[PDB]
Amino acid sequence: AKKLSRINGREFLKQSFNLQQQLLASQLNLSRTITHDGTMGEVNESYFLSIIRQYLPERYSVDRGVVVDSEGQTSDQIDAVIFDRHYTPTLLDQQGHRFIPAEAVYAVLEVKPTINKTYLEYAADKAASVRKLYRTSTVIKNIYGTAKPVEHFPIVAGIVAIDVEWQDGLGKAFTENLQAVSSDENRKLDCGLAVSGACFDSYDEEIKIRSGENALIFFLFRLLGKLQSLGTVPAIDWRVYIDSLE
Amino acid sequence: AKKLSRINGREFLKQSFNLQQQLLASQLNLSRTITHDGTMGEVNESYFLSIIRQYLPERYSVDRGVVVDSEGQTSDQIDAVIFDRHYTPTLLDQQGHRFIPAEAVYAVLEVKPTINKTYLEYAADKAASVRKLYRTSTVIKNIYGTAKPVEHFPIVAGIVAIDVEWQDGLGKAFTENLQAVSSDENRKLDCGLAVSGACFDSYDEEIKIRSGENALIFFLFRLLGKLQSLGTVPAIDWRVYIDSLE
Amino acid sequence: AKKLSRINGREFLKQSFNLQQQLLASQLNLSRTITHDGTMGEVNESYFLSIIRQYLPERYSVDRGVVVDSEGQTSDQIDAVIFDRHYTPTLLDQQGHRFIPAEAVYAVLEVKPTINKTYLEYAADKAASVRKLYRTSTVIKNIYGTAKPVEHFPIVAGIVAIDVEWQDGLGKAFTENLQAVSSDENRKLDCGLAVSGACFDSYDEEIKIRSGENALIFFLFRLLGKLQSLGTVPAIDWRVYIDSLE
Amino acid sequence: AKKLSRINGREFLKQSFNLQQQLLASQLNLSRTITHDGTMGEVNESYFLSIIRQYLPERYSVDRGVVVDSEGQTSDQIDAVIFDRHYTPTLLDQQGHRFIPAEAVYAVLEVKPTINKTYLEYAADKAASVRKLYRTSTVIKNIYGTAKPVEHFPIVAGIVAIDVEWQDGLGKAFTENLQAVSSDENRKLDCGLAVSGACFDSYDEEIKIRSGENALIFFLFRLLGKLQSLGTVPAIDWRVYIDSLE
Amino acid sequence: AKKLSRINGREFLKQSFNLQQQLLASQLNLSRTITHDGTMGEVNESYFLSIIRQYLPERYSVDRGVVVDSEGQTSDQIDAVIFDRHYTPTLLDQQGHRFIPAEAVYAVLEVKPTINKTYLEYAADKAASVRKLYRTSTVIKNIYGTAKPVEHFPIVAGIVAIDVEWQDGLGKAFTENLQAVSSDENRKLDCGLAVSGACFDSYDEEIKIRSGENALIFFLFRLLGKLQSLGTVPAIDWRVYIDSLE
Amino acid sequence: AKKLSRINGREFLKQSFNLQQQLLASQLNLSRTITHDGTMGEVNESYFLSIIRQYLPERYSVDRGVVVDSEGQTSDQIDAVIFDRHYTPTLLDQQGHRFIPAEAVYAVLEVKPTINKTYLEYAADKAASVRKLYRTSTVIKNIYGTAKPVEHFPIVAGIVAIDVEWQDGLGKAFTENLQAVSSDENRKLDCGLAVSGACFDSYDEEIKIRSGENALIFFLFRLLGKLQSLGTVPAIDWRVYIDSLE
Ligand SMILES: [Ca+2]
Ligand SMILES: [Ca+2]
Ligand SMILES: [Ca+2]
Ligand SMILES: [Ca+2]
Ligand SMILES: [Ca+2]
Ligand SMILES: [Ca+2]
Ligand SMILES: [Ca+2]
Ligand SMILES: [Ca+2]
Ligand SMILES: [Ca+2]
Ligand SMILES: [Ca+2]
Ligand SMILES: [Ca+2]
Ligand SMILES: [Ca+2]
């Protein structure tokens, strides 16, 4: 039996996130093990989806699915999409199998067995499949009148994995590979999380890396801040989703 | 067995709405049949409510009930109300039996057996019972300070039915009857849907009509756009719902 | 059997709130009785939470828990917190046991056996435990650009109880005790409700008191108005919840 | 303000039901008023459905809809069906618009403006539309082996209304009319509730009537007992719902 | 960053429970700390309720509230009741504030700061307040006919706490105090859990104690087995909850 | 616009299933297309899970995950498991990522791009990974006393796909391949569904095949019957999931 004294606010905050990080590591590694490293099934993104949905403000929705645009083009299948449903309609889909208008998307994340060159490249491919889609923006009626259309922001993209393959972790080889992957704005990976205890992002332009027990809390609060900086999705042009129909 | 090749984004969008249109047609026509054309019970609006709730952005709530104002006046029973709950309180009601402050209302729709003169007139009567109610508007605290009260918008009103009775569909006789019904701003019917495959609206001032497989997707996206143009409900004056109480 | 004629809108509004007031009185008094006036357990705040959650606009969340700040400091256990989750993250908690960032808080209420001097003082102590916590505010990206940080508002605090102990109700002795308790901005009690049928608030600076069947509807609409005047919580500085972590 | 002392268990039980009875009376009478006695819309059964769903054991499901049998025959639209979903499949319907296999049904109730001869006859017609449908019963695999098919029970049927029209309440004229209506096993009305404060049933063969504040609690506990006596629905013959399909 | 290899089934089972044990320890100890050892509020039982609800088979319901019998008698306020809702009605209550018929109860648990003599005695007092209530049992209609009434079983009772106060844990002093408390069948404590890592039960008549990382999984599986041995609650006599009403 | 007359019960039953079959075909084929025939992601089983969960009686639970036994052994990742939660505990998992005791399992289904030899073999491999796991069975307390342990039944296994690859559909080549796959009781595929419009099963020992619009309704009702014949899962031995723990 553990000797328990008292728990203070800082300690409880750390534990509330680190124990969830350990739970995610256990679940995602079970899935990686059972699927033989993603070769006999996809790593099960569901518990990651649940945790990020629980954390994120309710202005954000979180699910897996496919992104579509008003030109009829589709992304690849995306493991985790962070998107708007407060202002943007739902295309008569349901939880676990979304078909999302590109205008609604804030961020996308791919869940892979490990952070390595191969899987960074795959996650960047998924990102590009979303960022290549066309997005509309229209005027906005509000308390102060009608605002001009909001400029689109770059969609945030990342990778979530069980661990980091390089022996030195997220080190020089990692940053060189990330710099090379992110040599195309459609392919940029802004952030990533390994639930064994590492995270990175380029939100401040320079690559910032964290390791250890607080990786999840760092990843989530830093992502919160990046999302904050984006504002709300622009107003979808409803005309363009019906203009080719008879 | 059907020969299935591949499904593209445009095709999936069309099917996702047209198959729901067919499902609604089947359900609403069952209800029309069982009730002997609305004479032994009301056409069951519940599946329509579910579909429009699923489609609409989450800033909108959808339910059946009664609308009330700060003068104690009530509308008739309304089959489908699109309304705000993000800023406007709930009068201790529950799903399926709402008692809604008039300030919260964006739109109302009546579900009837068919689109014909009699049922257009009934749907216009229901609309007028809502539009006659009194609505308040107060100042709005926001990030930029306090905005002056927002001007009210006209509530949108429409009809949903199984089919269209005129042999020529939504044709010259229809537009003349709609023009005559909508000769009173309280009675105007802005839009309508027959799930057999027709829709209309006057959102662009002229009457625009669509028929066939895409009626539902047209109706929903055009309604989305009309709603977009309205902004958010004005801020309710909380004083007027308690000013006659001791 | 009661003779029932008809029900009008004003009458239904009054009943919809007064019958809920009677239900709350019955439940809270059962809890007060079973716990021997709070001495063998806390008065069960759950049904109060349900009613205020049902009434309040969906921009507000309602639950019990603990408030924490970016300095690691905690409030006492709070019976009812009205707070934001639309813009502010959730610290991986669940319903009934929240751990809430101080920036999210609009109001706090303590549930006690009765309104008397002792319990007013306890409710003021709980309020101060929340108001002493540190709150951040950052710039706000929005359709019109980026707004400067929003100034914090004073958190609203109150007391909910079964009845009022003074024989004269909320009278001269009450207002003197409330004036003395509220001689410290951190300890101010802005409002209160006794479900036997009394309420008070200082929203208009002078103390306004109501008694009888409409106490609940007065309390809720007046609180709605006070909340309205506050706007939305300022934007949390995400940096300060991770700045002490390695 | 009301003087509140203490609440004991018996008192809380009575209040928990009588206050809900008053709430239902208020809601159903609002609906009766707004619809002009059922002539401009159906009385809204939704709050009744919610209360009986809340009370009844979870082996029972409660909703509105249509009952269908394996011969393709349908009942009329039914305001409240008490039915099984634990052993009996759902025909891909949703809440508020059920399409229920006759084998699943325990009881049906019709909601009308008042208890009078006309509305008793209508409620009996609805009952007969359900009881005329064909029901199957097959062997039952269980811990002790396989049981022979269970014999069907008579479906329970009743009426729910706002009040009772006869000046003498549920008196001699009522019992004579109920005796005449229930002169056909398909048309029998086993029970009824007027939320103004009356109930009746023939569960003990003789007609038993209650009036006043405890009408709802009597109706619900007596119905519970009648349901108890029926056991679980027999096992549906899955073959008969697909035997006419190619 | 942690080195992660693979996760096997046994390892994942252990982690899935031990990490939840650590989470509960963190939460319950926060609550114990904030409330100053239960003296400024009750330890928050909500997260315990969530975990046991999640684990237990769906034949069991779990909540806090008060137990009542057909004689109008009430228990004290109970932190966690495991009870039936599949066969036994709900007395128009809601989650977090149940008013439960004694016939429905399988088990009760009290949440306290620590396992010590004082808190064992308090948990035994709570148990006795439930076990003293009167329970009915009636015949049971089922596929094989009608069974005679089922004999009542003893309600299971226990204690949940953060840790164990004795320096030697659940040792000789503990077993002597538990033996003395459990010298009255109404006061018997069958089991207990300290989330720091200890559990006990007398399910096999002798006291069996476990310590360490697997305390939660032991407690839950052993409780599952004890519950299994009880069968389903007997059939409530519906007559006795209405026999004193007019 | 379609000419709509009336809808009868048989017609509505057929449409309610066939339109859902068309919806599933559209969704699953979108997923097959976007994933390049399962090579760039798994076919999204989520909408299939939703439909079968909606249809099946509530004694059955439906989800994806991994099956585990009391020996610590795991199945492969399973796309759809039909299992018990009414009597069998949940191993602290959540929807979309279940970790299921083998004793709880009634059936398993694998979702693949098409019915062909390769994918039949893969679905049989998944089945065997579940059927190889160890299952316990203990005595059962019930109204009639204590029953001896229930004998285990063979788990049902199948395949769900978009279409059938053989030009002749489910013909001679299919039945020979199914006969060869099912030459090992652990590998037997009892049933399958192609949402383009074919289904098969061996529930009656001989292979029965259906094609066309009614494939889904046939598959679901025939599966219902097969499940019916199995009874309820045996009672899990709670001891064996904790016997290797210290
Ligand atoms: Ca287009
Ligand atoms: Ca993946
Ligand atoms: Ca007024
Ligand atoms: Ca209607
Ligand atoms: Ca800090
Ligand atoms: Ca309190
Ligand atoms: Ca048939
Ligand atoms: Ca009716
Ligand atoms: Ca009694
Ligand atoms: Ca306690
Ligand atoms: Ca074992
Ligand atoms: Ca698959």
Side-chain angles (χ1 to χ4, degrees), chain C residues 204-219:
Chain C
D204 298 327
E205 302 316 296
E206 60 196 314
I207 307 319
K208 287 187 181 185
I209 298 170
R210 292 290 185 154
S211 58
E213 294 179 344
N214 299 315
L216 182 62
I217 192 169
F218 275 113
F219 176 84

mmCIF file of all heavy atoms in Angstrom, chain C residues 204-219:
data_model
loop_
_atom_site.group_PDB
_atom_site.id
_atom_site.type_symbol
_atom_site.label_atom_id
_atom_site.label_comp_id
_atom_site.label_asym_id
_atom_site.label_seq_id
_atom_site.Cartn_x
_atom_site.Cartn_y
_atom_site.Cartn_z
ATOM 1 N N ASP C 204 -28.823 45.535 -8.467
ATOM 2 C CA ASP C 204 -29.096 46.946 -8.697
ATOM 3 C C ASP C 204 -28.533 47.805 -7.583
ATOM 4 O O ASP C 204 -29.013 48.921 -7.365
ATOM 5 C CB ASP C 204 -30.601 47.170 -8.879
ATOM 6 C CG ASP C 204 -31.147 46.418 -10.107
ATOM 7 O OD1 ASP C 204 -30.386 46.284 -11.090
ATOM 8 O OD2 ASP C 204 -32.299 45.944 -10.080
ATOM 9 N N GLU C 205 -27.519 47.288 -6.892
ATOM 10 C CA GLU C 205 -26.815 47.928 -5.783
ATOM 11 C C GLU C 205 -27.668 47.893 -4.515
ATOM 12 O O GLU C 205 -27.223 47.369 -3.488
ATOM 13 C CB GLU C 205 -26.283 49.318 -6.162
ATOM 14 C CG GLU C 205 -25.314 49.308 -7.384
ATOM 15 C CD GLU C 205 -24.273 48.165 -7.357
ATOM 16 O OE1 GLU C 205 -23.425 48.144 -6.442
ATOM 17 O OE2 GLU C 205 -24.306 47.281 -8.247
ATOM 18 N N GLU C 206 -28.898 48.386 -4.565
ATOM 19 C CA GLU C 206 -29.766 48.203 -3.412
ATOM 20 C C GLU C 206 -30.205 46.745 -3.322
ATOM 21 O O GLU C 206 -30.288 46.034 -4.331
ATOM 22 C CB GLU C 206 -30.975 49.127 -3.483
ATOM 23 C CG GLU C 206 -31.854 48.937 -4.694
ATOM 24 C CD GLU C 206 -32.784 50.116 -4.906
ATOM 25 O OE1 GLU C 206 -33.409 50.563 -3.919
ATOM 26 O OE2 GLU C 206 -32.876 50.603 -6.054
ATOM 27 N N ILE C 207 -30.449 46.290 -2.096
ATOM 28 C CA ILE C 207 -30.897 44.921 -1.866
ATOM 29 C C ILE C 207 -32.363 44.849 -2.258
ATOM 30 O O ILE C 207 -33.192 45.617 -1.751
ATOM 31 C CB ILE C 207 -30.704 44.499 -0.403
ATOM 32 C CG1 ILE C 207 -29.270 44.728 0.078
ATOM 33 C CG2 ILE C 207 -31.090 43.047 -0.224
ATOM 34 C CD1 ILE C 207 -28.245 44.379 -0.907
ATOM 35 N N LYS C 208 -32.685 43.952 -3.173
ATOM 36 C CA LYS C 208 -34.066 43.697 -3.566
ATOM 37 C C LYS C 208 -34.448 42.304 -3.108
ATOM 38 O O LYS C 208 -33.710 41.346 -3.362
ATOM 39 C CB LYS C 208 -34.215 43.778 -5.077
ATOM 40 C CG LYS C 208 -34.138 45.216 -5.557
ATOM 41 C CD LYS C 208 -34.457 45.324 -7.030
ATOM 42 C CE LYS C 208 -34.352 46.767 -7.512
ATOM 43 N NZ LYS C 208 -34.792 46.885 -8.927
ATOM 44 N N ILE C 209 -35.602 42.194 -2.464
ATOM 45 C CA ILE C 209 -36.077 40.958 -1.861
ATOM 46 C C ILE C 209 -37.466 40.634 -2.418
ATOM 47 O O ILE C 209 -38.306 41.532 -2.588
ATOM 48 C CB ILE C 209 -36.086 41.084 -0.323
ATOM 49 C CG1 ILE C 209 -34.676 41.327 0.202
ATOM 50 C CG2 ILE C 209 -36.678 39.857 0.336
ATOM 51 C CD1 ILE C 209 -34.653 41.705 1.653
ATOM 52 N N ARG C 210 -37.707 39.350 -2.671
ATOM 53 C CA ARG C 210 -38.992 38.817 -3.100
ATOM 54 C C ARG C 210 -39.363 37.638 -2.217
ATOM 55 O O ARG C 210 -38.495 36.932 -1.697
ATOM 56 C CB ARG C 210 -38.942 38.329 -4.550
ATOM 57 C CG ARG C 210 -38.764 39.440 -5.522
ATOM 58 C CD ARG C 210 -40.031 40.279 -5.565
ATOM 59 N NE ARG C 210 -39.918 41.304 -6.584
ATOM 60 C CZ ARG C 210 -40.953 41.847 -7.204
ATOM 61 N NH1 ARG C 210 -42.195 41.548 -6.862
ATOM 62 N NH2 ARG C 210 -40.736 42.699 -8.203
ATOM 63 N N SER C 211 -40.659 37.457 -1.999
ATOM 64 C CA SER C 211 -41.118 36.318 -1.227
ATOM 65 C C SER C 211 -42.317 35.705 -1.924
ATOM 66 O O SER C 211 -43.024 36.357 -2.704
ATOM 67 C CB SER C 211 -41.434 36.669 0.228
ATOM 68 O OG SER C 211 -42.412 37.669 0.300
ATOM 69 N N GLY C 212 -42.517 34.424 -1.645
ATOM 70 C CA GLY C 212 -43.692 33.721 -2.103
ATOM 71 C C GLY C 212 -43.468 32.788 -3.279
ATOM 72 O O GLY C 212 -42.354 32.305 -3.540
ATOM 73 N N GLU C 213 -44.555 32.572 -4.020
ATOM 74 C CA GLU C 213 -44.608 31.507 -5.017
ATOM 75 C C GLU C 213 -43.648 31.728 -6.168
ATOM 76 O O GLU C 213 -43.282 30.766 -6.847
ATOM 77 C CB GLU C 213 -46.002 31.406 -5.634
ATOM 78 C CG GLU C 213 -47.114 30.989 -4.729
ATOM 79 C CD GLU C 213 -48.437 30.962 -5.479
ATOM 80 O OE1 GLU C 213 -48.509 31.550 -6.598
ATOM 81 O OE2 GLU C 213 -49.390 30.341 -4.962
ATOM 82 N N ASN C 214 -43.282 32.972 -6.446
ATOM 83 C CA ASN C 214 -42.457 33.309 -7.598
ATOM 84 C C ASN C 214 -40.989 33.490 -7.252
ATOM 85 O O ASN C 214 -40.230 34.035 -8.064
ATOM 86 C CB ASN C 214 -43.009 34.537 -8.311
ATOM 87 C CG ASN C 214 -44.395 34.318 -8.824
ATOM 88 O OD1 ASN C 214 -44.723 33.281 -9.418
ATOM 89 N ND2 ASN C 214 -45.260 35.274 -8.534
ATOM 90 N N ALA C 215 -40.568 33.064 -6.059
ATOM 91 C CA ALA C 215 -39.166 33.248 -5.697
ATOM 92 C C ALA C 215 -38.206 32.618 -6.699
ATOM 93 O O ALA C 215 -37.163 33.216 -7.019
ATOM 94 C CB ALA C 215 -38.896 32.707 -4.297
ATOM 95 N N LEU C 216 -38.476 31.383 -7.137
ATOM 96 C CA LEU C 216 -37.540 30.730 -8.058
ATOM 97 C C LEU C 216 -37.462 31.469 -9.397
ATOM 98 O O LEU C 216 -36.369 31.666 -9.947
ATOM 99 C CB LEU C 216 -37.933 29.265 -8.289
ATOM 100 C CG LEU C 216 -37.003 28.464 -9.208
ATOM 101 C CD1 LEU C 216 -35.562 28.337 -8.659
ATOM 102 C CD2 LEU C 216 -37.559 27.075 -9.436
ATOM 103 N N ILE C 217 -38.613 31.827 -9.979
ATOM 104 C CA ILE C 217 -38.568 32.489 -11.282
ATOM 105 C C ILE C 217 -37.871 33.842 -11.180
ATOM 106 O O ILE C 217 -37.098 34.219 -12.072
ATOM 107 C CB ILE C 217 -39.966 32.544 -11.947
ATOM 108 C CG1 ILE C 217 -39.842 32.974 -13.421
ATOM 109 C CG2 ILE C 217 -40.901 33.480 -11.219
ATOM 110 C CD1 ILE C 217 -41.127 32.803 -14.249
ATOM 111 N N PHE C 218 -38.099 34.579 -10.086
ATOM 112 C CA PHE C 218 -37.370 35.833 -9.872
ATOM 113 C C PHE C 218 -35.876 35.597 -9.778
ATOM 114 O O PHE C 218 -35.076 36.279 -10.437
ATOM 115 C CB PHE C 218 -37.848 36.541 -8.588
ATOM 116 C CG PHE C 218 -39.046 37.394 -8.780
ATOM 117 C CD1 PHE C 218 -40.243 37.061 -8.192
ATOM 118 C CD2 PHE C 218 -38.952 38.555 -9.526
ATOM 119 C CE1 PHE C 218 -41.390 37.874 -8.398
ATOM 120 C CE2 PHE C 218 -40.064 39.366 -9.723
ATOM 121 C CZ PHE C 218 -41.280 39.012 -9.158
ATOM 122 N N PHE C 219 -35.478 34.637 -8.947
ATOM 123 C CA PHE C 219 -34.056 34.365 -8.770
ATOM 124 C C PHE C 219 -33.404 34.017 -10.096
ATOM 125 O O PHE C 219 -32.316 34.524 -10.416
ATOM 126 C CB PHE C 219 -33.886 33.227 -7.759
ATOM 127 C CG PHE C 219 -32.462 32.782 -7.568
ATOM 128 C CD1 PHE C 219 -31.626 33.441 -6.698
ATOM 129 C CD2 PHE C 219 -31.986 31.690 -8.242
ATOM 130 C CE1 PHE C 219 -30.325 33.032 -6.531
ATOM 131 C CE2 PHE C 219 -30.680 31.273 -8.066
ATOM 132 C CZ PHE C 219 -29.860 31.978 -7.208
#
